[PDB]
């Protein structure tokens, strides 16, 4: 959910 995350 954070915009910098790469994987769910």
């Amino acid at each position, epitope marked *: 959910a954070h915009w*910098m995350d790469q*994987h769910f």
Partner: antibody
Amino acid sequence: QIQLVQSGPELKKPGETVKISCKASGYTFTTYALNWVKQAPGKGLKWMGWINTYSGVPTYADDFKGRFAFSLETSASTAYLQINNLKNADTATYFCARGMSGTFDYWGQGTSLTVSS
Amino acid sequence: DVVMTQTPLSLPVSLGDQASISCRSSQSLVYSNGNTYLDWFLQKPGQSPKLLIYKVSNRFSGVPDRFSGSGSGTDFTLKISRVEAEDLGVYFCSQTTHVPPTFGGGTKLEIKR
């Protein structure tokens, strides 16, 4: 045992190009974002943008659109920062930092860049 | 872009004393998922930032028990319960709630005389 190791100090002239590396160890490189941060002598930290280490897609902050390029060597768990058409105002320490869950949790040691004619 | 304002700019302490540093943001740092992406870092001269506290109040692994964080919304505090020599340096807050991430200007923890 997580570590980000950056390339060594650079001295360059205005108009030249420089490429700085950031090699990651101790985790799966493609799982987490890598961020670039500028620290000009006695100035506040400035976020430059990030690269998605899985897709390779870069995102540039508004002051770093134009002459800055983020790239990867995923095979070597290494990220690169290239600065083209160097200006005097590019003089600074550049850091890479891992982004995990919205936090810059591990930083590189920094790469000093000095720009002078 | 969100402005992060730290107070004071310089904090004199005696070794063994408590220290408190403030960080205020120009906007709420609550994200749409309910998290507050406010972190605290120590930077020593010629070295990189080291994470102390993440998401307001979570102590990062390896960080001594004497560091703690508190606060909510736009108003945040880092406390050191008993200052040691290794703790002198510059403390910075960061937010990543809003793009672009931004940083406070830093608070220097120094020796009182």
